[PDB]
Amino acid sequence: AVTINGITFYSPVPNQTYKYGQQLVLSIQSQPNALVTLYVYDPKGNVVYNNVYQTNSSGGLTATIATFGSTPGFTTVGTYTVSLSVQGTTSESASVNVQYVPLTSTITATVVNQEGSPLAGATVQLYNTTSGSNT
Amino acid sequence: STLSLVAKGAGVVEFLLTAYPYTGNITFAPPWFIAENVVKQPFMTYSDLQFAKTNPSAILSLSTVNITVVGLGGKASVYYNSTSGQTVITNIYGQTVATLSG
Amino acid sequence: IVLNGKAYSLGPAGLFLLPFVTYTGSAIGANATAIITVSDGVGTSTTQVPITAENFTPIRLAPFQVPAQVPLPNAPKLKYEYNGSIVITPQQQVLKIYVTSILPYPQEFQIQAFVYEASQFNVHTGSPTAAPVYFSYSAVRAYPALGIGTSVPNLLVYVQLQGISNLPAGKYVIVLSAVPFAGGPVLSEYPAQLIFTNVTLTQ
């Protein structure tokens, strides 16, 4: 486990890649009773998640932060800044440069005849009929 | 019944330890700051429990079945595990490295 | 715990100590090593930075204003709010701080200089409000002593920047961080970073 000292970050660790659908859970053994505003900035520098927590007597915070890949802003590729702004009397900071992966999909069309030889020249039109009209 | 007890308080586990380092030299006292809170306080199944139950505070010779140490990753503990009468020593991810008879 | 002469392992000792750093997932503490590649414009070299339990001591970043041999262990572990104003005149291309360590300390490392606007770091919070707008590093190769009078284990750290013609005038908040040298030593504490809030660069 990493620590930029004052925060025992059980997670995240610097330069970590989060997946499609994966949960950030903010597990940081830090100093009791402080105002821990985690700004989960996306790569455009706006707060797609933001919430102010407070570490308990043990010191562990447990909070599932973000559901990546299922919220706008956890859809955009590049370096997020997972920024703790720790407000006590004397404020402290943390900058964690974390990533995300993109996606796309692929479909197949196979043709065959009664002679068992794949035809060459059969046109196959693929429309997106989800809307209820041939997109 | 458990009312007033011996060992009703609990130990202290200091942050700066009675530990020494090693690499090739045993000497030096490195900052032991056991990271970001020990959450404190040894707990113990009293050795002579049944009569300790009625002791307001007396001086016995206890056998201590937890010592609380919490740093990075997991938490370590040390204790003379009174149940099999065997000193259990553990790690900060926790495995019994030692069962030492009596 | 070596009880009566018989070593009884208690798990990783770096987790009982501070400093400890698992920088980029690669854990470094007491009884560690960094072999570091440095393949550069002059060719390639490779330093080796072996870490010893008894090099342990916090590595502070303290500003100019604080003398070099004067510690701050009663300021925070992570960042102390420097609310003063460094005036960088245009004869200066260099940011002056004292890295304070009161032990012989040989471990080679760097300072990452992540420059930000003070609208790119809200000066009413401790938020760097985006990804570094420009990054430039200074590999500060510490010296245990080359003789006090030659190099001192209390270092005058003069962060020079390439692209101080890629940085023009403006009110910055700069984040200097005692950073491992891309897989380098254990570092940092009291305070681990220094963040300079009413700076005004002038070129």
- Neighbour-count burial of B100, counting CB atoms closer than 10 A to its CB (0-12 exposed, 13-18 middle, 19+ buried): middle
Number of Cβ pairs < 8 A linking chain A and chain B: 31
For residue A76, how many C-alpha atoms fall within 13 Å in the half-sphere facing its CB? Answer: 13
- Beta C79-82 vs C193-196: how paired, if at all? parallel
Residues of chain A positioned with their CB less than 8 A from the CB of C177: 4
Cβ distance B97 to C57 less than 8 Å, yes or no, reads no
In angstroms, the CA C65 to CA C34 distance is: 33
Question: Which helix H or strand E contains B49, and what residues bound it?
Answer: helix B49-52
Note whether A95 contacts C: Cβ–Cβ < 8 A. Answer: yes
Residues of chain C positioned with their CB less than 8 A from the CB of B25: 54
In angstroms, the CA B60 to CA B37 distance is: 30
Cβ distance A6 to B36 less than 8 Å, yes or no, reads yes
Q: What angle do CA B49, B50, B56 make, to 5 degrees?
A: 75
Q: Hey, is B50 helix, strand or coil?
A: helix
Contact call for residues A96 and A14 (beta carbons, < 8 A): yes
Contact call for residues A5 and C190 (beta carbons, < 8 A): yes
Residue in A46, A74, A38, A15 with CA at minimum distance from that of residue C130:
A46
Residues B49/B50/B51/B56 CA torsion (nearest 10 deg)? 60
The approach used to solve this structure was cryo-EM
Both tokens of residue C18?
Answer: 């501070």
| A30-to-A34, A91, B72 alpha-carbon distances in Å | 9, 13, 11
Q: Please tell me what resolution, in angstroms, this structure has.
A: 11.2
Contact call for residues B93 and C9 (beta carbons, < 8 A): no
Residue in A36, A41, A15 with CA at minimum distance from that of residue C129:
A41
Residue in C139, C131, C111 with CA at minimum distance from that of residue C196:
C111
Contact call for residues C135 and C171 (beta carbons, < 8 A): no
In angstroms, the CA C177 to CA B11 distance is: 38
DSSP code, position C53 = G
In angstroms, the CA A9 to CA A98 distance is: 14
Q: Hey, is C90 helix, strand or coil?
A: coil
DSSP code, position C84 = S
In angstroms, the CA B101 to CA C5 distance is: 16
Locus of tokens 């016995």: B60
- Neighbour-count burial of C186, counting CB atoms closer than 10 A to its CB (0-12 exposed, 13-18 middle, 19+ buried): buried
The Cβ of residue C112 has, within 10 Å, a number of other Cβ atoms equal to: 18
Q: What angle do CA C126, C128, C133 make, to 5 degrees?
A: 155
Cβ distance A85 to C126 less than 8 Å, yes or no, reads yes
